[PDB]
Design a protein around this ligand. Structure first.
Ligand SMILES: Cc1noc(C)c1-c1ccc2c(Nc3ccccc3C(C)(C)C)c(C(=O)O)cnc2c1
Length: 127
């Protein structure tokens, strides 16, 4: 079968912005997660074809991954921090929805989410 197009990382019709919170999300949160031992399966869109997961995009209709988030941050795609936090949450929830609770990928996601929550706990006040 085929993969869907990936989520957009830029859009001329979407207002763009940089805030200190978004700067923190790229510099501190994304960077910390990106270098984690278990980050790699989350660093790009799920390739359902090459991973032989024909039902993935039948079940997951709002895909998200850290590669997309990284690019969105780099492109000033977001208007605010909440949009970016929502993308992280979508990434984690998708993983928990599609996979079985005791699967390795779920434990990998759980480790990353714990670290994510630790880092966004110190999200600075907006300036
Ligand atoms: C993230 C994510 N969310 O749902 C799924 C499904 C994934 C996912 C899972 C595995 C990936 C993967 N490797 C792979 C393939 C089959 C079984 C087990 C794995 C492990 C646990 C080793 C990662 C790769 C890869 O092998 O490159 C890429 N993306 C994946 C996404």
């Amino acid at each position: 079968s085929m993969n869907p197009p990936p989520p957009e990382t830029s859009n001329p019709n979407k207002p763009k912005r940089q805030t200190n919170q978004l700067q923190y999300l790229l510099r501190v949160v994304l960077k910390t997660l990106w270098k984690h031992q278990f980050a790699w399966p989350f660093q790009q869109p799920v390739d359902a074809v090459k991973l032989n997961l024909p039902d993935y995009y039948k079940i997951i209709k709002t895909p998200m991954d850290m590669g997309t988030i990284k690019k969105r941050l780099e492109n000033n795609y977001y208007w605010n921090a909440q949009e970016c936090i929502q993308d992280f949450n979508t990434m984690f929830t998708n993983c928990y929805i599609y996979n079985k609770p005791g699967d390795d990928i779920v434990l990998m996601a759980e480790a990353l989410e714990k670290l994510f929550l630790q880092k966004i706990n110190e999200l600075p006040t907006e300036e």
